[PDB]
Symmetry: C7
Amino acid sequence: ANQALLLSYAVNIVAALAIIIVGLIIARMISNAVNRLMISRKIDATVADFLSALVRYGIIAFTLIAALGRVGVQTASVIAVLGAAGLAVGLALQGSLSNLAAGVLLVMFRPFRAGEYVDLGGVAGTVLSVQIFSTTMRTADGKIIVIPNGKIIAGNIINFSREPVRRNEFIIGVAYDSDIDQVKQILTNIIQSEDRILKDREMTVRLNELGASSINFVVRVWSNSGDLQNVYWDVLERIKREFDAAGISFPYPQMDVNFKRV
Amino acid sequence: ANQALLLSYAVNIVAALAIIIVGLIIARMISNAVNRLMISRKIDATVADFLSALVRYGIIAFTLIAALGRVGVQTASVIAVLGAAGLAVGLALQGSLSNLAAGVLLVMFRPFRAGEYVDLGGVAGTVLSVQIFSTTMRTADGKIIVIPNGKIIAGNIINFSREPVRRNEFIIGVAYDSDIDQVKQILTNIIQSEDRILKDREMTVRLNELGASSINFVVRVWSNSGDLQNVYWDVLERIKREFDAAGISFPYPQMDVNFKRV
Amino acid sequence: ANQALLLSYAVNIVAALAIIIVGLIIARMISNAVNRLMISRKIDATVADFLSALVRYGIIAFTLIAALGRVGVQTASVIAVLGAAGLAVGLALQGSLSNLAAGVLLVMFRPFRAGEYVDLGGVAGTVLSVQIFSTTMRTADGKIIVIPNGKIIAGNIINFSREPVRRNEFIIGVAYDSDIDQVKQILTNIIQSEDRILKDREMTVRLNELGASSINFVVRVWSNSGDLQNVYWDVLERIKREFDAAGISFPYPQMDVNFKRV
Amino acid sequence: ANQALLLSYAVNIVAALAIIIVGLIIARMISNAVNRLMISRKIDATVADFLSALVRYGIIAFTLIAALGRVGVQTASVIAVLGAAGLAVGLALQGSLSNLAAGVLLVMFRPFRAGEYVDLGGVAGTVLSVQIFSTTMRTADGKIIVIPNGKIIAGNIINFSREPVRRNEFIIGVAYDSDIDQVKQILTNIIQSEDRILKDREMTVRLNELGASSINFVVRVWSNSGDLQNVYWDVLERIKREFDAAGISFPYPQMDVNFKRV
Amino acid sequence: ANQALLLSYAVNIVAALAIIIVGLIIARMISNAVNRLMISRKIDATVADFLSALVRYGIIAFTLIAALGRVGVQTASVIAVLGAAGLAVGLALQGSLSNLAAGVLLVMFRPFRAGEYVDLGGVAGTVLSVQIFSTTMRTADGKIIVIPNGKIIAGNIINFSREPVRRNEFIIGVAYDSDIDQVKQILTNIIQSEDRILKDREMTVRLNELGASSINFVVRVWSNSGDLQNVYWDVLERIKREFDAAGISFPYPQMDVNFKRV
Amino acid sequence: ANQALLLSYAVNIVAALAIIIVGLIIARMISNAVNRLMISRKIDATVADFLSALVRYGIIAFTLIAALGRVGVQTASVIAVLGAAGLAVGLALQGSLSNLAAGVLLVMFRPFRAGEYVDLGGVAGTVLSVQIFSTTMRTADGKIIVIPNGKIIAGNIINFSREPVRRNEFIIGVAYDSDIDQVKQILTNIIQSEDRILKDREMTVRLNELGASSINFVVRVWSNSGDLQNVYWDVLERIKREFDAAGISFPYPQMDVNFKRV
Amino acid sequence: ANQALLLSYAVNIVAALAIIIVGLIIARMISNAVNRLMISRKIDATVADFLSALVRYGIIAFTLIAALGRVGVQTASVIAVLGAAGLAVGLALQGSLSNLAAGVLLVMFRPFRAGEYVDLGGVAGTVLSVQIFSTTMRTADGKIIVIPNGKIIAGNIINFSREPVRRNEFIIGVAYDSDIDQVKQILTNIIQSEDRILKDREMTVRLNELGASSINFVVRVWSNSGDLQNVYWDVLERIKREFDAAGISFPYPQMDVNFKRV
Ligand SMILES: CCCCCCCCCCCCO[C@@H]1O[C@H](CO)[C@@H](O[C@H]2O[C@H](CO)[C@@H](O)[C@H](O)[C@H]2O)[C@H](O)[C@H]1O
Ligand SMILES: CCCCCCCCCCCCO[C@@H]1O[C@H](CO)[C@@H](O[C@H]2O[C@H](CO)[C@@H](O)[C@H](O)[C@H]2O)[C@H](O)[C@H]1O
Ligand SMILES: CCCCCCCCCCCCO[C@@H]1O[C@H](CO)[C@@H](O[C@H]2O[C@H](CO)[C@@H](O)[C@H](O)[C@H]2O)[C@H](O)[C@H]1O
Ligand SMILES: CCCCCCCCCCCCO[C@@H]1O[C@H](CO)[C@@H](O[C@H]2O[C@H](CO)[C@@H](O)[C@H](O)[C@H]2O)[C@H](O)[C@H]1O
Ligand SMILES: CCCCCCCCCCCCO[C@@H]1O[C@H](CO)[C@@H](O[C@H]2O[C@H](CO)[C@@H](O)[C@H](O)[C@H]2O)[C@H](O)[C@H]1O
Ligand SMILES: CCCCCCCCCCCCO[C@@H]1O[C@H](CO)[C@@H](O[C@H]2O[C@H](CO)[C@@H](O)[C@H](O)[C@H]2O)[C@H](O)[C@H]1O
């Protein structure tokens, strides 16, 4: 029969809903304004969206604390419950947040760009795109790999395609009776007739190891990154043909045998 | 004999039960409304159920704090005890929550879809379905594997079936005395007569290594993902037959032996 | 001589004991009621016992805070001491709680059931039972293994017995001079006369590799999970007998030897 | 000269010491009563001692907070300092507490008992006793191993001695020219004359693999855990003697050699 | 000109210094008294020093909070700053505290004592002393190893010197044509003439494996820990001499060779 | 109609905006002043920027707490929400902060400088630059590697280029019948005629191992870091030529063969 | 126009700056006094600098809380912001603090000193100096290694140079037909004529293993740490010369061959 307290309670509830509505409006407005202010200062779009989302959820948290205080919930209760909900959402989004930060770093510092062959922790292939949470790459034989950004940032990032020039390394092994000067002279002529091998870099042709069955010569020559494999195959076929023409042997595995007829 | 205090205590208990009932009702209603509001905005059904469950448990926590305050328990006591119960439930559900978030990410970004052959951390097989906590896959020989979603998201996701085309790589090894031009010409004719090998891609036929007993030619040819294995087996049998017809040898392992009758 | 303060102190102590007794009674009653309410809603019995134990310990914590406030201990002291005791009990029960949650998940989602051969992280054997903290399994030779549930849930769960059908894979290796058509025809007749090999699945008989001493044919045939091993042994003995009858050889390891009498 | 404040200070100090003494007495009494109440309910003695120690230290903490409040230290100061001392003691006792809980679990669920051969994470030997913090075991050759209980509970617990029966697995390898029916018949007679091999279990004698130099027969037979090794050695010597009597050969490693006098 | 407030400030500062001095005195006295009280109850000296240091730093913390309150710093400020300093000191001393607790456990339970050969996680050598933070051991060839106590407690502790008796295991391999009864009889006589081999234990002499080139007999005999190596060397030389006298052969690695003059 | 409360609310909002503006101004000024004060004291530029950023964000946090208190938000709400936003930003920047600190340490202590060959955790190459978050290095063959600074600081940092002098180690293996004095004399003359080998260091020429087919001499000689590889190749070719001239043999792998015509 | 409030605000600001200045002065003075008091008590210089830095930053924190309270910032705000700045600085300095504590432990307990050969976790070389954050060592061939102190303290610390004496272990392998008494007598005379081998230690010369092609004698002899390698090389050359003079053979790898002309 006494509606006056009921009127006060309904009025407090309507005031709580009005505070919620106005708080969502002001949160969206201040967050969009901070986002435009950051984009105008050339902050990265993902960092801008992240900081704007944090500002919007903070203003919404103040609005919730105010409205729930209007309905009689204490500030300590609302802070504890919003903290538990935030800890749950943070447990769900912890790894995704790590991948988001790693993706921002990969887009900012550019350890690798799309189209560059790389080697991210033992997998290797052409990069296709860095994305919000993971990087796609196509391996040499066409398989697609999707590496999460945090694993990429946490480890080494070998990059085959960054330097214009790269070095071949042949390991020719010839018979122990082969002349050393003739081998070095033939390998030197083979790498001096190769126009794609850079003459201003190193061009080693040195005996390198006395192996179990052969003396292993090493040849190290530099070439542009686009000519590396073709130079390898061409120098290899030329080595084979010229050694076969010159009489130098490539040994089969060797074994002395001390015969004992028991 | 003095029932007035007893009446006040029974009235406070009934008011606490009434606050509990009304609080559960309002919690269920606001949670269903937030869930419908999120589903209408095309949020994922699992993220919608998660955020709605958080809203419902938060409103129930406010209701518990209010009723337990009506029975005389202090707000600090109720917050501490609900925080301990929430920390226990969170210790129980930590890994399941990680798998739930990883499953939401796998369904959203689609690193792999059902029916695509993959390789999730060293296990490989056709995917069957991504589920709330774990992914099922059937390996090539019919074993079922159940990989938890967090392990899948944390590591690499090789995907054999995403790209339409993929590359074969034969490694033929022939005797050192074999002619190189004849080997390359026979392998080239074999891969040029193969209609399932894409002629617009690479078709390498290059000497690749001077091995212990053989010179290892490499052949790399591209084909549609569905023709890859049949092209491998057909080119392999054709290589065998044509080399046997042409007189080119596949060496047995070689060994020079220096006889010494001691 | 002034017993009035002594009377007030003894009365406060008796009131604290009465609050403790009534609080234990109400805790047991509300916990049993919540447990019956959950079991009636078809919640899992272990989750029901867990949530009921949490409700009972929470009501006991409120009762302790009330009684210890009656004896003059402050609410902050009781909350801090109960929090330290709860942190100690939680450090003791952390791993057991992880195993309990993993066991609930294994009983709910059924990645494997009792009597199904599995492979949980490198150990393999018939499952015997999933239990509250660990799973028992009997390996193929009769050893018992007890894997804690958390280790099982955290890793892959290969399941040999789930699919009705599974694939055999023979790897026959014959001499390089062997006819390929005759080998493929004999293997095809051997797998076509085998009634336990499913004719509606794949039945590959393809040359697969040119090995060091032999050409390795592959045979892949599907059969029901109960016939897999018997089909393997029967096809193997039939391959051996028919190749010996047809004159096809299984090579011994090969080695060319270039004799050099030095 | 004004001793009245000095009298009040000395009286407060004596009251603090009296509160400390009475609090230690009541703590010891309530802890012993809770310990007897738990032991009477058949709780494990270690869990009883743990919960009683927690009750005793909690009552001592309330007594310290009361006395230090009597000397003028605030409740927040005493709670913070006791919390720091408890965090230090907990950092010191964290691993010992994990081992204590794991030892309680090992004594309760009995994955292994004393005198049973086991394999706890790659070490194997007869168990000697489970103790409060670590398990002792004597390996087959007499070395003692002391494995902490937490490492045991965290990993697999293979148990060689639990099942009454266990399976032998011989892998006989005979020459390719050996008759298969004669080999299977001799192995079958050898395992049928062995009274310690259980005839109601499996008794496989199947050709299993066509190896590099031999066809590997497999023999799997079950026997009681106490007869396993003696049955292995006896069947092995009988296999050797009967194959030597029957003319079946055990091949030496084989190698074809294609002689080439260059 | 108004020195009265200056007098009050100087008096408060002198009172703060007096509280600091008296608090350090009372802290040292109560800590020494608790230390003597623990040593009198046969607590370990390191645990006694640890708990006494905690009591002394706690009383000093109360004294600091009181004096800094006298100079006007609030209790919350002093608690926060002392908590930050304690968290920094704890980050510095975390590992040293873990090693201290592990050293107390190693001195209490004695998994190993000084002079006993052990194997702590893959390093092995005579123990020299357990110390406050690390254990010293001298390996068999005289290198000193210093293993931190926490690494020792966390892993297995194999102990070669605890059991009085230990088992040798010879693995003799003889030619396939060797008589089995003669080999077993010679090995049995060799281990029956050895007085240092315990006749009340096992003395197996069983054929154990049919190897690639030899049948591997096993001999397992027990002896006192001090006679183990001398018994090994003596039985080994006796096996060699008696087999050479009896005509039994130790095979060289075997290889059939199928000659093919191509 | 009653605008007086509306005037008070608009005035409080304008005062909050004015406090925000003045607080940002004072934050930027005090942060720039602290930054100049640190740079003037020769603090590292990165540590200066870090501490100045912390001072600026702290002053901005005080300004936010003041303005949000002016609009009616409580201090506890603002502290909790700013703490949640700071915990989120810290979860995003945790790894980047670890790399920043590691980069400051690498620039301060200089374990390696640019242009020095190193080996950071199994990858090796010339360092190019240490940067804010990762170190770039060019391997010997031209690949670029980008190692995050925290991984570098956490592990070993081998440094090939720091010491002026470094040691070669040849391992010559000659036939068992070779004279030892003649081998040692020839190797000694070869390393005494080499002017780039430091005569004031060690120059060992000792028989080191009796191998399976050869006695392995060791030669260890020191040389300047720039002459190391050229000295290796020159001494190797001189060893080969002088041994071939002196008649000393480099054995092929050896094998006695006990012929048995069965 | 009303400057009185403006005068009060400017006066409060000047009082805050005066409190800041006086607080920095008193912080520096008390920190230097505590540092001198610790150095006078022979505390380590690094622990003294650490505790003095903690005292100085604590007094500065009290001064900041007082001044910021004078400008109107609440104590809770200042404590929260200083706690966030301290948590950020602690996240940056966590690893450096671990290395600092480990370096203090290495300088105090001296597991190794400069100039002693060691083996810290698989890297080995002469120690050069222990430093504030990392230890430098020069490997045997002149590479410099920089191991962070925490990695050193966390693992084993083998120390080759601590014990005055160390043991050589030769493993001579002679032909099966060689006399055992003659081999043992020659090895005994060789190690008895070696004056640098300690005659008061063990001098084993025992047959140790019957290998695939040779009986492996073991020789274990002790010598001073400075004579170890020279004794090894001298005993090795003497073994070689005396066995060649006595007619004892070092076998080449052996192989029986059962000829079969098929
Ligand atoms: C009340 C605040 C509500 C809003 C903020 C919510 C925060 C939620 C925090 C959840 C717990 C985060 O705890 C985090 O766990 C990882 C586990 O590898 C650890 O640190 C980790 O950081 C990233 C993830 O951010 C990982 O990819 C990385 O491998 C590791 O360094 C630390 O322990 C801590 O950074
Ligand atoms: C009072 C609030 C009540 C409601 C919220 C309850 C929260 C309960 C939190 C329990 C502890 C979580 O602590 C978590 O532990 C894991 C351990 O790998 C670490 O972080 C982990 O996150 C996920 C799980 O979320 C793991 O799959 C992942 O391997 C790892 O990065 C961090 O330390 C922290 O994220
Ligand atoms: C005041 C509240 C009293 C009642 C609640 C008591 C809670 C006690 C918590 C103790 C500390 C738990 O801290 C826990 O440690 C493990 C260590 O692997 C980490 O997380 C772990 O969770 C489970 C155990 O729950 C492990 O099996 C899992 O390997 C790991 O992910 C996180 O760091 C945190 O989940
Ligand atoms: C104020 C309260 C005073 C009384 C209570 C004192 C509690 C002291 C807690 C110290 C820190 C414990 O932090 C613990 O660290 C280990 C580190 O592996 C992790 O969890 C660990 O639990 C056990 C030990 O209990 C380990 O054997 C296990 O390998 C791991 O899962 C979690 O991080 C947390 O459980
Ligand atoms: C309210 C304050 C707001 C401002 C400050 C925000 C701080 C945010 C802290 C996030 C959690 C940090 O938790 C951190 O996790 C890593 C996980 O490897 C662990 O420690 C780590 O430190 C660094 C990163 O700093 C890692 O590179 C390192 O591998 C590891 O030692 C510790 O658990 C803790 O240092
Ligand atoms: C408000 C206080 C402000 C001043 C004090 C600031 C403290 C800052 C603490 C940052 C987090 C430290 O968290 C730390 O993380 C490491 C991560 O390996 C873990 O412990 C670690 O300690 C040291 C570093 O101290 C590591 O080298 C070690 O490998 C590991 O045991 C623990 O989780 C915790 O010791």
